[PDB]
Amino acid sequence: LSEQLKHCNGILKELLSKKHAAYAWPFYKPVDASALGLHDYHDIIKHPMDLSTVKRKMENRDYRDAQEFAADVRLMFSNCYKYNPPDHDVVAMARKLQDVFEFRYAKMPD
Ligand SMILES: COCc1nc2cnc3cc(-c4c(C)noc4C)c(OC[C@H]4CCNC4)cc3c2n1[C@H](C)c1ccccc1
Secondary structure (H helix, E strand, C coil), rough: CCCHHHHHHHHHHHHHHHHHHHHHHCCCCCCCCHHHHHCCHHHCCCCCCCCHHHHHHHHHHCCCHHHHHHHHHHHHHHHHHHHHHCCCHHHHHHHHHHHCCCCCCCCCCC
């Protein structure tokens, strides 16, 4: 990995760590729309994203730069904010995990 992609991998490990598990866990795996009874999910969300998919892409060297990695993490949060009413518990959890992400992403080495 490039230096910037090492920083991204560190962020990814933190987002998956026990430290943040209380609010990160809904983002660990793809939304199982059928299992959750969310039969409109794939009509509303055209590009699903989750941390297991970001991890697989990082492991496969899919991300060529930090910007491409960040676009997937933000897509994951944006999907949550698009699908769910803003007062829902899962949106509160998204906001908290995105705060962890944005503050550490901002510490990117130049
Ligand atoms: C113990 O609870 C069972 C349970 N397992 C899971 C697994 N993944 C979930 C993913 C989402 C989710 C995200 C993220 N972004 O968009 C969605 C939609 C999730 O969203 C809550 C919606 C379900 C019904 N409308 C709101 C829930 C997930 C989930 N859950 C439950 C249902 C849950 C509920 C509230 C907060 C977190 C998890």
